[PDB]
Symmetry: C2
Subunit: 357 residues, 2 copies
């Protein structure tokens, strides 16, 4: 994998140092080989044993999935991704392809489709960029060049940045480019590992949050819109832990929540990006619950958001998101999904959420 054994630990903890809860965790006694073989068995003769496939690929991490792919290749000298692609069809084949691909490639490909169609699917850009930290973003960028090649791009130096709108297009586009640069505030692995011990004071900074609050507060108004970067410089660079602190300080000081301030001072996609990044730090389960809810518009595989989100969030925080969703909507996420989808595609999603078949 290009993402290592796990997504960045930066994503693993709520504002308070509490482990988010995934629906998928590395599999005790995992054997790529065992799984490769079992998958091989599940594709045979007329038809296919779909549930067998699901109960493996939808119960492993991206890293384990890639190990399986590598084991499969080694063994059968065949290609897992293809073997699946030939014996499945429709929506089920679609979700399987999103599953057997390395995460950064699966995201890079979505970014590719969001930009290369008619009109720019910014919702997807915002959705995906919000969820990547520096190293992941870099892996996604590299995956992107590989996607262009896989599409037969004859261009030597086409790139993610190359395909994106120019910073001069506006505040939103500049912020997007800022994030792609992949130079947000980072936390050493040591510190992150220790969050569930020392808590979070070690990785935040009051003098900083307080100063940033002052900057955030003084950013806005008209007459001067010449490169107003302060809001971007803070929201799009501070760690989720630091942003939370800034958020707390800002409300104590000013009497309006930092979120309300953003919603009031910015517009269009720029606002949507800022709101996404901030809520991903201070209000994530709800943010992604809402995203999931919006993704369910009876489109099936016509829109990828639903499966992209379930697949990715399954190994980070999908369970907390499931809980948020029910609180917000009165219906379990599991049921919303059962209602909006069908077939083996549906079964895959339910298993990703922890359902058993």
């Amino acid at each position: 994998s290009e993402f290592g054994i796990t997504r960045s630990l930066i994503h693993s903890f709520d504002p308070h140092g509490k482990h988010y809860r995934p629906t998928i965790k590395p599999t005790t006694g995992f054997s790529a080989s065992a799984d490769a073989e079992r998958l091989h068995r599940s594709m045979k003769g007329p038809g296919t044993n779909e549930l067998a496939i699901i109960n493996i690929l939808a119960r492993r991490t991206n890293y384990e999935r890639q190990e399986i792919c590598q084991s499969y290749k080694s063994l059968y000298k065949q290609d897992l991704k293809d073997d699946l692609k030939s014996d499945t069809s429709g929506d089920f084949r679609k979700v399987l392809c999103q599953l057997i691909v390395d995460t950064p490639y699966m995201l890079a490909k979505s970014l590719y489709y969001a930009m290369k169609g008619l009109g720019t699917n910014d919702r997807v850009l915002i959705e995906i960029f919000t969820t990547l930290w520096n190293d992941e973003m870099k892996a996604v960028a590299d995956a992107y060049k590989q996607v262009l090649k896989d599409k037969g791009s004859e261009e030597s130096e086409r790139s993610l940045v190359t395909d994106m709108k120019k910073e001069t297009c506006g505040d939103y586009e500049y912020a997007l480019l800022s994030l792609v640069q992949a130079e947000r505030d980072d936390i050493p692995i040591l510190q992150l590992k220790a969050i569930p011990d020392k808590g979070v004071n070690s990785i935040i900074n009051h003098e900083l949050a307080e100063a940033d609050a002052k900057d955030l507060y003084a950013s806005g108004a008209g007459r001067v819109g010449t490169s107003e970067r302060r809001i971007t410089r803070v929201i799009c660079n501070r760690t989720p832990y630091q942003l939370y602190l800034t958020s707390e300080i800002y409300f104590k000081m000013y009497g309006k929540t930092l979120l309300e301030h953003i919603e009031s001072e910015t517009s269009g996609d720029y606002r949507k990006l800022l709101v996404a990044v901030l809520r991903y730090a201070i209000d994530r389960p709800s943010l992604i619950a809402e995203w999931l809810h919006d993704s369910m518009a009876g489109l099936g595989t016509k829109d990828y958001a639903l499966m992209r989100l379930l697949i990715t969030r399954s190994e980070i925080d999908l369970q907390d998101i499931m809980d948020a969703y029910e609180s917000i909507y009165g219906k379990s996420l599991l049921n919303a999904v059962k209602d909006d989808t069908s077939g083996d595609y549906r079964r895959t999603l339910c298993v990703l959420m922890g359902e058993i078949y």
Copy 2:
């Protein structure tokens, strides 16, 4: 008087089938600019502003009449109606009053200015406004914009509406947006428009053009990766509402998929929303604006100008038809939704625009 002239352009005036759209505000055949001026003037004298009197005039006149009233009041009292209303009212009431006594094109230009001058871009507002302007209106707004820039400081005798917009290289949405602001959409001469109830919409559309357009529209899908696809933009943004409707019908008979569906599956982002807005402005307008009004009611008051902008503007064009659609769609009158989302003399002003007059 008004850079829009006595009315909004007649090109907005008929539905796809040739029937007149129904406004909540029509030119008053007994209209006396001076008489209204006098009445407004009385309303303000003394420390007891009669809000109902003010609202029941200004919110019951077209933009042309309101401007006629401004002028008459100016010559009559050496005083500026706008100023006198501002100094005699406050809060949300003053806000809505200011949107109202300003010439439509200036009012739209100010909102465009704010949609761009701030942090990020209020594209929703650009789509909403540009969608609703035909060529001459657009040019009047462009002019008024230059006048907003002077009013707001700029000493740049050459900065304009297009200067402030995003460049066409920023993407399909931006390019399409710019094409509307180009103000080179197909025209229909007034005389032929006025004749529609006589001659029918058939006299004003082109079956052969629609077929050819329908084919170009369908082609925009194969080899979706080559050069910048502009054909959808050209057709959707330029055809008159009447031609687009015909194009929509013909497109469906040929391919068994609505033109809307086609657009919705082939395009994304603000580009889709702009195209969808423009198409629906032609073929599904009452519903389209009823939804716009619905989405504009989020309890923001005079912090979001969309609700009052839409009401003010649609009032003299097709607001009644939009009201019917609104209740069909949402199961509740637009009147009652508006009353629930607003209050004060502002609420009252909005209600009067839709026709609900309360006398004293």
